[PDB]
Amino acid sequence: DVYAQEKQDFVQHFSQIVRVLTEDEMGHPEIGDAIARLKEVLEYNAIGGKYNRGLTVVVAFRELVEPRKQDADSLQRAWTVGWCVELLQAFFLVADDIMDSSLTRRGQICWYQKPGVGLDAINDANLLEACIYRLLKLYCREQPYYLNLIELFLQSSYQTEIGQTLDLLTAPQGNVDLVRFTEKRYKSIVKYKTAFYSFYLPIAAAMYMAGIDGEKEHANAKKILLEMGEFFQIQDDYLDLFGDPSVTGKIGTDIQDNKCSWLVVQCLQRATPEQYQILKENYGQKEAEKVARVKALYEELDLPAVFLQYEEDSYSHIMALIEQYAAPLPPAVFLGLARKIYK
Amino acid sequence: DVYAQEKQDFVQHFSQIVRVLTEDEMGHPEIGDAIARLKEVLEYNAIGGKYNRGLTVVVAFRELVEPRKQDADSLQRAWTVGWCVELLQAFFLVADDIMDSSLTRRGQICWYQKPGVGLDAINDANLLEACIYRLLKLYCREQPYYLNLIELFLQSSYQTEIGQTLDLLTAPQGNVDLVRFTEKRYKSIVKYKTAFYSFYLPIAAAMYMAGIDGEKEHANAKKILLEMGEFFQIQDDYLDLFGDPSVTGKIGTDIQDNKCSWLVVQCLQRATPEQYQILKENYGQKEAEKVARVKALYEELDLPAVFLQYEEDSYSHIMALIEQYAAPLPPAVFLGLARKIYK
Numbered sequence A, B: 001d002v003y004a005q006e007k008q009d010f011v012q013h014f015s016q017i018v019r020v021l022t023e024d025e026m027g028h029p030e031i032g033d034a035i036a037r038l039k040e041v042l043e044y045n046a047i048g049g050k051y052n053r054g055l056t057v058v059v060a061f062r063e064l065v066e067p068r069k070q071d072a073d074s075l076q077r078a079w080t081v082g083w084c085v086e087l088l089q090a091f092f093l094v095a096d097d098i099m100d101s102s103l104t105r106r107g108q109i110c111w112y113q114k115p116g117v118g119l120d121a122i123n124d125a126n127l128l129e130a131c132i133y134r135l136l137k138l139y140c141r142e143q144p145y146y147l148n149l150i151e152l153f154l155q156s157s158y159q160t161e162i163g164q165t166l167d168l169l170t171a172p173q174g175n176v177d178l179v180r181f182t183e184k185r186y187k188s189i190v191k192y193k194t195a196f197y198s199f200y201l202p203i204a205a206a207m208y209m210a211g212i213d214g215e216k217e218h219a220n221a222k223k224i225l226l227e228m229g230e231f232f233q234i235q236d237d238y239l240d241l242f243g244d245p246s247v248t249g250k251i252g253t254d255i256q257d258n259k260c261s262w263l264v265v266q267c268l269q270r271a272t273p274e275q276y277q278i279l280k281e282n283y284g285q286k287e288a289e290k291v292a293r294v295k296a297l298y299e300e301l302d303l304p305a306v307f308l309q310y311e312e313d314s315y316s317h318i319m320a321l322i323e324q325y326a327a328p329l330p331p332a333v334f335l336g337l338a339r340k341i342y343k
């Protein structure tokens, strides 16, 4: 598949990305120690994930650009832009793990939790963000899409940041209020916090790199991609609890963390006043006896079945969206990504 | 003076800046609560300072643009860009106060220290940064200097962030090592962390707005401005201890906080091995008996006199720099700013 092959060439490009970002140390020895710290921040935080978002840039680039315009340099730029998406992501996760007091991320200690890092990781996350624009300048300054990419990355950071504001406002630390766990609120969090950067940004970046800079073309791809983003997060919340940890590679803590999950939203929409109380008493607690009780309430309220129906309706929706909005982009741009997302 | 008059028109523009940044709530009600939080972050953090950096943009704009090109809209843009400098600053200070565990800033409780904010202020500081590019897009998208300003703000954020890395590396929390408090290191911290954004950025922004986009013109102004930035921070560190709090409006805590101050750098350059030990034992302690001892060591080593000589040499240097590098900019751009800085 388009991804599994390219993954290697993508990951191998990282070494050049790091060398290039640590190359201003040559002209300015004075900042050497700061650059050594930047190298360490990059190596720790931009590696160890699945690289799918960054890879989507590359895969979409190959599918949107005529093979004769896919020269060595065009490709170096595609991998670089892909890495920029991963750096945007690395910046949000470093910051989010500080904010929600996370202990681990992808099985390793969160960067801020590392001995001698702590709150300095706030500056480290800012550096990761700075690196996107340094890379865009280094690789894409002379390209006609340069400003388009800068604005897309900045807008995507803004939307994610607004998404994080909404999330932090919906589920504060030390605040169990299920009144604000509405469908409308959930959909907005996913849209702003995850969907734009995860789904819209990668395709949109490849689209600009391909000279597809049309407002309607971007609006049409966004329409498709934000729906893909919404399904992806709904599926993630569902798998968090009801998924098998051996397949997902994660053990669900959404209930323990008072997360505004699709599962809680659906439970709240269905639950009788007595069931609302049962949830009020057990949602957000660390105890495995209370974690088992929320799960049993969801199973009682037939949420795995509500998810199954949601999955079917979602699949018809995304196909209706692809048919109506893909053109003039090859439907394979969206289908290849949907296949990776939908099961 | 150029500043004191304009200060009012500058501060009055803030209300429009806030209205404009909270105006996307109209089209997207879904993010309303996040926008309400953004309004509160802006109001708390961008107000209460002296606005000198933002004001420098406006003052330099008036001095670099022919009065016939200073129409209502050109001016709205000057104030907006000035506010962007203040927002860049508000973003660094919110983040820096978290990082160094600050309690107060300009007599008020640090934003993160406010009840119900805490580490969420990391996202708040990111929002403040996002606001610069939203303002540049809203006011300057159709201007020929648009990309030039975006790149200057991004480069200035990067340089400040590198400056902060260097600073955090030089004086870690719970690490009293005077071996790394060298002249060369001090000069680099000031250059990257303070000088670029505080002195180079404001003039450079006005310069681009004036169509002065030449690389040599910017290199020449930078040469002047980074020296102004270096004197400003050396003077600040000196006044922190030896200044009168009734005139400076601040009580010095540099000794208590193990800061890499010009005073410690000079003490270390002069101090005998026994005096090095006296400093090693008393530098970074909260006790007023030990704070009095470091001050007495500096006074013994004749640092107020070393500062006096530095002040005189610095004044001749900045004048030599103005004479050699101002052209073709009116020397008043640099002189008006030097007068505000040098006593």
Ligand SMILES: O=C(O)c1ccc2cccc(-c3cccc4ccccc34)c2n1
Pocket: A049, A050, A051, A052, A053, A056, A198, A199, A337, A340, A341
């Ligand atoms: O963080 C990752 O890389 C990651 C982690 C877990 C995942 C589980 C299913 C699908 C994807 C996935 C596959 C392909 C493209 C994608 C684009 C955007 C978002 C997700 C994508 C996935 N991605």
Ligand SMILES: O=C(O)c1ccc2cccc(-c3cccc4ccccc34)c2n1
Pocket: B049, B050, B051, B052, B053, B056, B198, B199, B337, B340, B341
């Ligand atoms: O944070 C502020 O606004 C502030 C606080 C204290 C100060 C003490 C002396 C001079 C300035 C000062 C005056 C004029 C323009 C300036 C431009 C850049 C930096 C400082 C400037 C100063 N500024």
